[PDB]
Structure formats: structure tokens, C-alpha cells
């Protein structure tokens, strides 16, 4: 009867909420993880099921070589004229003065149906949004990226008409809003409400200064006046609040004439050696999606409970409906294709990297490139979505040289991961090795190599995650586990720990095989258990 | 007449020398520059002409997104059984514990003919090489990359048989050599000389500790005995020597029964307010190729003149054969094909970025991504090949917003370049802007903006390179020039300045257009001049 935030747990940022009659959908960004964009469905705003992942083919999304946290940034999902519209980006440069990336449009009739081939829109900035103006005309909003040395990089909100018949942006482009002193003006969404235009934006950047700003105007092109108690959403001032980084919002008006606001947020683990006011913490689950309720006064919306958001939010006047779980707690790969919660890095899942059919009821992975490669990785993984869980798998892998390895991986990006892999030692045979990579600093800490007897058909591998730490354990028969006494830090796989300009995903766990010799040696995984506790 | 080194000036590393009858060929690496591999041709070893660039299709080489100084590393060109064999690499990771990359083989009847589609070989290490054993067997050598924490990454030289009929490696591989205390053992090339196997390698890394070591064995798989005066080539001990980084060599026996050694080298610019011992210099021309004469004693080759290598080298007993230049000093773009000294970053030249046929007598570049992008840049460039030159172009470009810019660029990688571009300012109209990117730190130092009047159809742009410094200048009438008073440092476009694990190319100059608004706004370049000051 209450909305319990985050409604989308783990890596699920930049929520774009829309209503198709009485059905509610939210699209979230996926960056380098393939297939692109996740769409969730809900009938009550409390329970959400993973319904679709539109960008399924390289003709829609080609991300081989994309930088970490490049690819699909904030998307925009809308419904109008009997079809869904998805505006998405493919960001190619995430560091330095430029942010080279391109905005595209695909359409579909059903969210889980077949999506069109993309139409080129523009490249002038990220967070593109498609606004269906009451007049029938259509408009694309985005932030304007300004590379010039002396200018703040977030130059404001651009507006330009989209011609449906010509399938291109037309007319003149106009900057309609420059933002507030919070700056980093971002995430524009336009709304026609009571004959006036409301421009919702994000400001402050997506770390702990994040905020949602709103302004209004009589004309679509402004000038816009800013909310008198702006920002309407932020946790910048409340470091102990359990919801942090609260911004990048979208508004929905329900079919019950109620008002709600979806936004991203982070749930940080804290230091204890440090003050939370100075060290705001680390978010291994990345940026998650939460929903707040809005109330109106004098033509201005307000977040009920205050600007920081609540964990428990007043659900709308609608019939509750839960959904069946969309993954197996223990997946034995008996299904025809990979479950919808598994994703690959950058490229589609094809025989290049593995198969679910070649060895039935197994996931076969052909050894390809290492975990530091932005190109071709034989790696299938799924999100951390709880601070407390166990993941476990069983691998048949018989490597012949030290350049072959396969096993269980916990992963943030190409420079930040840990891996417990079956590999080969030329003087010891098959061994089990722990490899740790922290901002490209690589170590293999076990001084005592773990030998695997030759006739063990399956090495059982398991990770136990307990909030701020996690540990690996292994078994040669499943009913007898041995724990590796190296406590790994969960905070080292978080938005707030990794270096670089792209820090936008979250921790993953999955099965991986690599063969840097060229032989493409396969690794057979009998099952994958993901059990939150 | 002597051989004058370097024989290939500017960015021309990892020479693989090769002989077909009385014709000599040398392949060099090209990294992210497309098309891949440069093959030069010679009949006297003194004069070399740019003859072919084999890897022209995305089916042979797909480098979109490749890191700076990834892509085509050291190649191997050989001639046997009436055809050419090219072994090349595509490196995808250049930083950190791994070096993910793949080695391929392609063949052709002539170097400037159509090359085959690639056969996969292995992925175990770079510097792959094909050996043609007198028994008719074929073998692939390459270094072995060890990623493990406690091990030196250069784990020795691997050897494995290649089956021509099965189009794949067969049998087991074996490490046949582990190097000397110089380590970083790489660049393996096998030679069968009077019933003895000689294994040539590079050691020391490609900076100032570079060396060429050689060893011999009665059997192909070792054990190998190292040269008694090893290494046979290096300038590590001679900081003042005009050739530095001397290593990564290959040997050829001429049809005159003489022996020569092709190797890479750097010609550094030195600061005479810095220790020549501590700071060995900066090479904006990258790694170039030189040739040394060999001489034998007791079954060991020695480099004539000492192991530092000579600047002037005794030529083989062959007739001089000079070649006419393969580029125009002023290229006016009247051909429907880009001159062979022009390259693009990572991808083919297609309508996606440019056209020489849409506006006749112009190079039209369609505005695409910035100079920091590893994907789709409308950028056509050619090597710095002298310390003294000027390059010049003329651009027709009418930008309508600040995200459109086109002009003349000096470039090393995506983090290191300068650019003089026609662009647009909301308050001032068309302006000429100087942009500087030093290891991704970005500046635009002109305080007073240069206003371009609306009546000006072409803006003329020039760079004048004078060894350690270069300067841009511009003109609205081709005859009256104004110098932009900020001296730029040529040493910042050098192997020795840029950060990261990939530092393997060299400085380029070329024409560029970017449009990060999305409109693909075209810029038309009327000509490109590149004129070396041979007087110096
Ligand atoms: O576009 C989305 C936003 O949530 C956010 O956008 C900005 C990207 O650059 C960062 O430096 C800013 O902090 C951030 O606000 O991140 C990317 C994507 O998730
Ligand atoms: O493969 C060629 C070699 O000349 C050289 O190989 C090594 C690559 O890693 C660097 O750290 C070493 O110094 C270098 O010797 O560079 C690449 C290519 O030119």
C-alpha cells in the first residue's frame, strides 16, 4: 500500500516515466551493457517488472570499443499517437573538453515488440528528450555541451523542432534556459500543464550535489521563471539521509489525477573513519530509481516530505498488482535464450563469445579478451541489487596454458574488477587464482596457489556479499566449501571509487572466460545462482 | 653514393625488410592510421618509394574505437613460393596488465595488388613473424605476453608450426629463447644461414634502452647461444649519438651477396638546459627506419662502424635507382582519389567523413567528431617528415554555431594536438580560433579573437615548423600573412611527451572539420601544401 524506494534496485539510473493509458513504464540507461536500455512495467507504481530491452541489434547500437560509462546515457521514453518513442544517446567520449556522442530515435507499437531502425537527431549534447506539444508539433530538448575553455560546459537547454514527416530536426535551434547558480543544467523535460510550460531539469551533477530544478513559462521558448523554493529535490544538505544524489527527475500524471516524480538516487556505504559531511560514501549498487509524490500549490509542484525524498511514499489510488519474478534464483540454462537479467559488455551475445545450445543446459563461453578490454569479452553478468547476497556457479574448464582462465567475476569497469578463475600453471597444473584490479593496478594476492586435482569435473565458485565487504569461497564437490581469506571491499566497485570521467554504472557479478592465446578454449557453466538474503 | 639514414623519414617504425629477386621491400607499422601497413620499395637500398598500403578494407582491419597507438604494431613481410606474406597485428589494449591483440596473415602476388582476407594465427603476443624453413615447413614466431603479477611481461619467444594447407597453427608451441638481462625480448625473426639458425630479437623496450640482440642454434627450437659481443646494435650507452632507440631490426642478404640490417631509430631534439644523460630527448618525427651494413666473423654478424649505427652507410654494389616523388608539393585535389601519403584515423575514407568528388578540385570534409574521439573523425593527415617545413591549406567553411570548426591541425593522438580552425561565435560571427590539447588539458590562449569578414570565401592557413617550435599563421588573400604570436612546442607532439602505454606513432599535419551539433556541415579544402626546407 506504500511505495518502497528504491523501486528499481541496483544499477538503474536516469528514470524516464511515461503513461500509456493505465500502464506505466520507465526507461533507464545502460551505458556499455548490452542489449541497450531497460524498460520496466508497473500497474501500481509500487511493483515493477523488467519488460523490454529495446536496443537489440548492432544496427541500433554499435558499442564495440566504447569507453567505460560511454554508450547509452539518459534515455527518454514517451507515448503519443498510438506508439512509443525512445530517444537515446551513444556517447563516444567521456573525458576531456568534448563529449562526442549522438542522439537517436526509435519507435515501436508495444514496448516489448520490435523497435524501428534509428533516426539521426543531433549530436549537440546528452539527455535528449522528445516533447509532444499539444499543437501536434514535436520538439527535441537536450543540454548544450560547450567545449570552450572559458565557458562552463553545461551551456543550457537547447530546443529544436522535430519534423515527423521529414524524419529530421528542422528550423532553428534555440537555447531556452540557462539554469540557476547550481549549474550543470541537465536532463530537460517539458510539460504542458494548465496552459503553461514547465521545464524540469537536473543540476549540480550526479554526485552528492545532485538536484532537480523546475521552471515555468507561457511560451515553449521562454523566458522561464524558476520555482521560488528551488531546487524541488536534493539531498545535498542532508548527508545522513538514506537517499542521496537525488536528481534527474521525470514527472507523470496518473490516470487517477495524481502526480508523481521518478528520480535517480544512491544509497552509500559510509566510512566510520570519516565524517559523512566530508566523505559522503560509496555506492556499489550505483544509481537506483526512486519515486516521490508531488503536491501542488499556486501552480508549483512540491515533493511531499521535503526535498530529500522518502523511503516510504504514498502509493496512488490504484489496484495493487505484483508480478512473477523474471529470473531463476538458480538458473540451469535450460531455457532457449539467456535470461533477461543477464547482459554482455558492448556486443551482442553470439557464437563469437558463447552459446546456450552447443552444450545444452550449460552456458558455454569461448575464451576471448581479458577483463580490461573494451572490445570482445566472453563475459555474461547481472547487477548487484542487494547489499546482502550470494552468487554461485559451477565451471567445467580444462586450460592448457597460463593465458586461459575462466570463472566468477565481480565487475565495475575494465579497470575495476576481481575474478576467481580456473587457470593453468606450467609447474602445478590446473589452479584456482584470485586476480584483483583496482583502477588498473593489478595484483594476484594468494601466496599459496590452490591446486585442483585433475579429475574434478566441476569447480564450484561462490561469492558472499555482506554490505561493505565480500569474500570468495570454492568447493570441489559443492557440499564442502573453503573460504579464501582475502576480504575484498565492496566500495572499490562503486561510482565513487573508480577513476575517470565516466562513473555511471554499478557492480555486476557473472561468469567469464578468457583465452589470450587464440585457441578460444570453451568453458561450460552448469548453473548460476543469485540469491539475495 | 652512400645510404643516408634514416631511409624512411618520419613515423616509420618496425622495419621488416624483404627481397624478391632484385627488388627490395620494407614494411613498417601504422598503428591507428588507416589504411594499415606501409610498404616501401627499393632497388639500391639508398632510395625508397612508398609502394603500397595493403590493409584497405574493414574486413582486413577494423580499428574503430582502438586506443591511441593500438592497432597495427610491428608487421612481418616475406616473399616465398612466388607470393608475398604479411603477418600483422591488431592491438586492442595498450595499458595495464594485459595486451589484448590478435595476429593475422594475408597474402598477395604483388605488394600493390589486392591482398587476401586474413587468416587468424594466435593472440598470445605481438611482433608476429613468419619463417620459411628450407624443409618447406612454415613457422610463426612471436613474443609471449605474461600478464601475471610476479612475472616480467615479456616471457620469451614462442614458436609454432603454421600449416599452409589447413590455414592455421598446428602442433604445440614452445618457448625457444628467453633473452638476456636487457629483457623485454621481442621482435623475433629467424634466419637460416649455412645450416645454422640465427634468432634476431629486440630488447630493452623502444625508448632509449632499445637494442638488437642475436643468437644462434643448430636446431630451430634451441638452445640458442647469445652473440659474444651482444647486443649488436644499441645507442643506450651513447646519449649524444645522432641515432637513438636503435633496435627492432631485420636482416636481408642482397643479390650481390651482401648483408644489411634495417632497424628503427629516433632522432631526438635536446634541451640545452637539461642533462643529456637525464633527458635523452623528444622525437616529434617518431620512430624512423635506418639501414646498417653487416659484416661477419666466426659465424657472428657485426654492425659496420660500431653498434651505435652510422648516419652514412656503404651502399650495395647495385646501380643507383632514384624515384620521382609520390606526392605533390601542392596537392590541388584534382584527382578522385586521395594521395597515398594521406591517411585517416582508424576508419576508411568514405562519404561518412569526406569526398574528393562532390565538389571538384576540393577535399570536402563533413563535420564529425572532435579531435579527442577514437571513432569517427573527418581528419585527413600526413606525416611530419622533416624538422623544417611548412604546410598550408585553404578552407571554405561557413559555420553557424560554436560546435562547428574546420581547419589545419598538428596531431599526435586524441589527447595531444593543436588546431587552427574557422569557427563561429554568437557575438562576433566567423572567427579563427587556436585550440591546444596537451595530454587532454585543453586551452584556447588567444585573448583577442580573430574576426573573419563575411566577404572572405577562403581562409588561408599555414604552419611553419622550425625544429623545437612551430607557429601558425593565416591570410585572407593568399599573399598577406599574419603570424599568430604563440610559439608551440614541437616536442609536445612526440613519443617522449605523451602519457599512457601507447607512445608509438609520430606527429601529423592535415585538414580537419568537426561538427558536434549534428548537421554534418561541410568544409571545402582547395589545396594542401607540404614543403620541406631542405636547406634546413
Ligand atoms: O546523463 C546522465 C546523467 O545522470 C549524468 O550526467 C552528467 C554526466 O557528466 C557528469 O560529470 C555529471 O556529473 C553528470 O550529471 O551522468 C550520465 C548519465 O547517467
Ligand atoms: O611492437 C613494436 C615494438 O617496437 C614496441 O613494442 C613494445 C611495446 O610496449 C612498449 O612498452 C615497449 O617499450 C615496446 O618495445 O612498440 C610497439 C611496436 O612499435
UniProtKB/Swiss-Prot annotation, chain A:
GO molecular function: xylan 1,4-beta-xylosidase activity
Active site (catalytic residues): 14 (proton acceptor), 186 (proton donor)
Site entry: Important for catalytic activity, responsible for pKa modulation of the active site Glu and correct orientation of both the proton donor and substrate: 127
Enzyme class: hydrolase
The keyword Hydrolase is assigned to this record: yes
Keyword check for Transmembrane helix: no
GO biological process: xylan catabolic process
Top-level taxon of origin: Bacteria
Record Gene3D superfamilies: 2.60.120.200, Glycosyl hydrolase domain, family 43
InterPro entries: ConA-like_dom_sf, GH43_C2, Glyco_hydro_43, Glyco_hydro_beta-prop_sf, Glycosyl_Hydrlase_43
Matching Pfam families: GH43_C2, Glyco_hydro_43
Functional description taken from the UniProt entry: Beta-xylosidase is an intracellular xylan-degrading enzyme.
The family this protein is said to belong to: Belongs to the glycosyl hydrolase 43 family.
Assembly and oligomerization: Oligomer; homotetramer or homotrimer.
Protein name: Beta-xylosidase
Organism: Bacillus pumilus
Organism phylogeny: Bacteria, Bacillati, Bacillota, Bacilli, Bacillales
This protein's encoding gene: xynB
